[PDB]
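Quick entry between incubations.
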Amino acid sequence: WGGFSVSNPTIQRFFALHYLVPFIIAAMVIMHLMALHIHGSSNPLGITGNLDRIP
Amino acid sequence: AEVTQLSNGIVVATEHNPSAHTASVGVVFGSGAANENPYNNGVSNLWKNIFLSKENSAVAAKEGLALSSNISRDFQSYIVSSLPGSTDKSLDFLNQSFIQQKANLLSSSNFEATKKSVLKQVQDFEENDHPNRVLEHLHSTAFQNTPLSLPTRGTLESLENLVVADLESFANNHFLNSNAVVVGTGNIKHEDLVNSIESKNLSLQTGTKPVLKKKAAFLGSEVRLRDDTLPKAWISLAVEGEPVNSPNYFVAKLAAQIFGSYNAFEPASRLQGIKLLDNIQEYQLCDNFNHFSLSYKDSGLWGFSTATRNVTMIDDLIHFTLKQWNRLTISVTDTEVERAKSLLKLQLGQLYESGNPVNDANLLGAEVLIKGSKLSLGEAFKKIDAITVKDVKAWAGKRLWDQDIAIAGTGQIEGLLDYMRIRSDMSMMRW
Ligand code: HEM
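Done. Structure below.
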């Protein structure tokens, strides 16, 4: 709170945190795409896709 | 150098050469593999090996004669060769064995032994000869459901259904006097040949051949025969080209000479004036390639074939080749056109002026059957010299820019991308 209840220091620190966390989300999305590049995607049949690929 | 055509009922064409030491005399028919149907495919290839069988070759060899035969898509020929003083014996052998009697050659013991030998040849072709069978598969996908798609040797499935009555039915429809030309090459004079034929009264049969109903038509397609146990990849690619009797016949041959042929293991082949060789030798994208321009009576094919051990960079090889084809519409230079003029004249002069009268008999008979005469090499050189850069740019804007293609391939072809990625490289989105 920065105090005794929800008040003026609470709203000012919540806006500054609200600016920052979408940039942390964008860095996790890059780490998410690196792990996907290693193995590729699955397919709706559940079996291997290495026999027929299109770019 | 002069040809002489004469008709008295039979078309007789000669090409006299008093410096040669042999002579060659035969007959060429105007039907090929494109006059068959999918059920008697291979009947022309069986008639060739009947003519070249052992008992027929032994009768010729006691006289001093040798035999040749060739099967193509539009024609077929049967040729006897001899010394220049015995062309009367060679014309007798063509009369007895091939015109009068054919029940001697078509006996049951001779037919079954010949059919066994042909089936083994077609089986060894389909298993071992990878560049030539990819080019055969390129014809069958580009002209599918059309007479220009049938292979010249036949298939194993269609050859085993053939009997003796199938060969006699083909001979009664195509081996006719109005479909034939009698040829003579080497050391033989023209009036000596027409008086030896007129001292008899040769005539095959009166009447005309059947007329097929479907005309040839190009279709953009592909066929893939993947085989991971083979050590290379073999690929052919083409667009629709020019037929015989086209006004752009020599312009299409000059455009293929610009890109030419290549061998990575010959040191002088690496130094040619071809701008495509800069991209290929940087990462060794292939082992060989060659460009072609084929022509038939109704259609043609223009493109290239290649063989590769670099199987992970196949997409770079197709991409660099097709970006050079774009330059024939946009930015082909004047020094590339002058280089292709001299090399096309050297290549045409070596094809028509070899020292083999059997090669000359096949070229002369096939051209008289379509056109009615033969164009001399002196007049062909003057048409090549008159081609300009603007002729090349106008031809390529019609036949190459944003057009459909046909692809065939075998071996380790996993790195070959699909059709629409290759089709989109036929234009630049720059011009
Ligand atoms: C901002 C958030 C996210 C972005 C931009 C994103 C992006 C992507 C993309 C582009 C793919 C590949 C294409 C596809 O399969 O749709 C993918 C796959 C995948 N994602 Fe996400 N994702 C996000 C959130 C999540 C979440 C919240 C989960 C799970 C709790 C998740 C789990 C997965 C999985 C398991 C795959 C693999 C699917 C497969 O291969 O069949 N992702 N993601």
